[PDB]
Every structure is written in C-alpha cells, then in structure tokens.
C-alpha cells in the first residue's frame, strides 16, 4: 500500500474489474504506466491499456473504449469509464507527435516522441495515424502522413488492410490465416536480422553454420515452426496486403515517382514499417524485438564459438 496518492484512489474504483491474479498484475501495469522511474513509450502505453482490458471481467470491458474525435484520425483517445459512464477514471490521448495521460482528470504526463518512420531519410516526414479495430481489439495503421519538401502533406487511407482481414474472417474461420503469418513473418524477421548483422560484421568470420544455428535457436525460443514450406498460396501476407493498399492511389503511386533516388529504396521501408505495426496489432509481438534478439543470438554464438 506504499502506493501514490492518486494511485490508491484510481485503484479503489478499478480494483474490482480484476480478479485473483488479474488483480496483482493489473497493479504493476498501472505501475509501469504511471509511476515508474520514467514514463511509457507511446507504443508501450497502448500495450499497457489492452493488457488491462484483457485482465478486466468480460462484463467490465464495455468500460474500455477507444475513438478518434470527429472520426478524424490525427488523434486517438483511449479511456476507462466508471460504472455509470459518468466521468473518466483514465484517459490517454495520442496525437501526431505527442501523447498524454490523465487520471481522474489530473494531467499525469505529456510526452513528446518523434513519430517519423522515415528516419534514414532527413528530407522526409512520414507518420502513421491509427484508429481502433474491432477484429483485432487494438488500434491499427489507418492513415499514412507524408510530408515532402516538394508537396503539401499527402495523406493515404489504409482502411483496407483491415478490410483484407474481415474478408479472411468471413472465409475459412480466420485463425488459419493467423497461423501461417505469425510463423512466416517472424521467420522472415529473424532471417533478415541474421544476414544484416553478418553484412555489418563482415570482418569477423561468422560461419554459415552460426548463421544457420542461430536462426534455428530463435525460431525455437519463440516456439515457431517452418511450414511455411511449401508456402500455401490461398493465404495473402500482410507485407503484400500493404503494397496492394498503396497501388491504387493517384496520390501515392504518382508520389513514388518523384525524388526517385530514393525510388524503390524508400518504398520497402514504408511498406515494412507499416507491416510491423499491423502485425504487432495482431499478435502483440514487436517483430523488431525479435530481430534484435536474433541479431543478438548471432553475436553471442559467434562470441561463444571462440570458446568451443
């Protein structure tokens, strides 16, 4: 009970959404969230929310609501409502480059992060705008923001990466698609991660065995399997899904063909950067964190191979 003034209070109005273990775990969620050494990342803060919603009694989930004011993307608000939907216990607001958190209407923190997915490019602003998806119980990349030096901020609608899934739910009953991807996507991610670290560490003589032996190691530690082979084609991958929902834009298609140096170069990042989030929306795994721990296997196996 060495909890904070408003922590104690908030708890006392919410302590009964959570049962048994849900209770103690929710508490540390609220901890990481509001009362840790530092404040959460924009993306972590959003995880923490839907970590709570998961922990809440099915009955009390109508209390966890997410919406863009005026249905306008540029902002997405996350909030917890009291029993009688009278006043907000917890409110998280996420704009373009800032996010903030309210508790009982006390401003608890405002953070400014830097939401440019196109950083390898100093000429180019590129933001993802999100709005809540019911099929995935999480926000999803719903609009792209591109700020060139040449053109005023072009927006690109994305409602149809979500639309590709409502189409897959209303087929064979989904999880089948959800099986293949999780096991394709992360195999791709580890693979990538490996090769990438061998290219930068060209001089260190990382064997093809280490490369192979590390790939299998993370595939293991994650519990992932490679069938896959031979990749059943009745299955549309997110990677492609994204490329597709960018093909039919007299705004975006024609954009790509300006500052083309920077031609197909800048594209594979935008697409990738999108997929990750859409993927993360689905499985709630940070594909990158894996890639790192893969890039990490490889170095600590190579380091390990100067012993054995």
């Amino acid at each position: 009970n060495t909890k904070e003034a408003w922590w104690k209070v908030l708890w006392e109005k919410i302590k009964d959404f959570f049962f048994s273990t849900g209770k103690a775990k929710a508490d540390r969620c609220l901890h990481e969230m509001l009362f840790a050494e530092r404040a959460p990342t924009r993306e972590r803060l959003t995880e923490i929310f839907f970590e709570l919603k998961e922990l809440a009694c099915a009955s009390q989930r109508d209390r966890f609501q997410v919406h863009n004011p005026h249905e306008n993307d540029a902002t997405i608000i996350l909030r917890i409502m009291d029993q009688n939907e009278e006043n907000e216990l917890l409110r998280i607001t996420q704009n373009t480059d800032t996010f903030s958190c309210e508790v009982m209407g006390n401003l608890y923190f405002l953070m400014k992060d830097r939401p440019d997915i196109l950083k390898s490019h100093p000429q180019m602003t590129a933001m993802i705008k999100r709005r809540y998806s019911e099929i995935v119980d999480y926000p999803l990349p719903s609009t792209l923001c591109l700020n060139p030096a040449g053109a005023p901020i072009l927006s690109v609608p994305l409602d149809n990466i979500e639309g590709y899934l409502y189409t897959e739910l209303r087929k064979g009953h989904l999880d089948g698609w959800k099986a293949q991807e999780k096991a394709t996507y992360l195999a791709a991610k580890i693979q990538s991660g490996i090769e990438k670290t061998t290219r930068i560490l060209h001089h260190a003589n990382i064997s093809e065995s280490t490369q192979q032996n590390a790939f299998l190691e993370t595939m293991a530690m994650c519990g992932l399997k490679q069938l896959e082979i031979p990749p059943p084609h009745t299955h549309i991958p997110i990677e492609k899904m994204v490329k597709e929902v960018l093909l039919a834009d007299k705004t975006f298609q024609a954009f790509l063909v300006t500052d083309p140096s920077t031609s197909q170069s800048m594209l594979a990042e935008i697409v990738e950067a999108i997929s990750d989030q859409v993927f993360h929306a689905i499985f709630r795994i940070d594909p990158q964190a894996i890639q790192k721990m893969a890039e990490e296997q490889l170095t600590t196996l190579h380091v390990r191979s100067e012993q054995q």
């Binding site: 003034a5 800032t98 006390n106 401003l107 608890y108 923190f109 400014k112």
Partner: protein, 105 residues
Amino acid sequence: TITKEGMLHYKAGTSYLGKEHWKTCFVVLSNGILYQYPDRTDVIPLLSVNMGGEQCGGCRRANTTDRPHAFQVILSDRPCLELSAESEAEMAEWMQHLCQAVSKG
C-alpha cells in the same frame, strides 16, 4: 508576456551521493522558454530550455519519493529537471502550463 514564475525546490541540481539534496531554485516560464535561476535575482540561468522544441521531451508527475508535489521536465540531452512545488494545487498549475507549451512550438 509572462506565463508563470515562482519558487520551487529542485533535486536535479544536484547529485552528490547517498541520494542527494533538494535545493531551492527560482523558475520562470516566459513565452515558450523555461528559465531556471539559482535565486530571485541571480541573473545567470542555471539552465534554460525551449519547451516547444527538440531540447525537451515533455513532463511527468514524478515518482513521489521524499518530497510531496514532485514532477520533472524531460530533457533529451539528459538532465531530467527534477522539481517539487509547495502544494498539490501549485503543482497542478505548473504541470499544466509546462505541458501546454510542449504542445505548441
């Protein structure tokens, strides 16, 4: 065009060992800029920051430790300016002006 001024106690300045002290400073938020002075007339600002731009990354209410109404000003090139007002009321007031100017430019 002033916004706010007044006395606060900052931990940020400084650290010895065995935790540290809470020293008094004077702080002014004028226009978009936060100036922090040693006291009410020591004209050389112990630190100044542009809340609006790259040098700051926002504010949070601090992990109330030994000192009652604490909060911090997030600075990317790595202080964090630690601060404690006198009353909860006084901190709400700072917190809201400070976080206001971050959302501005």
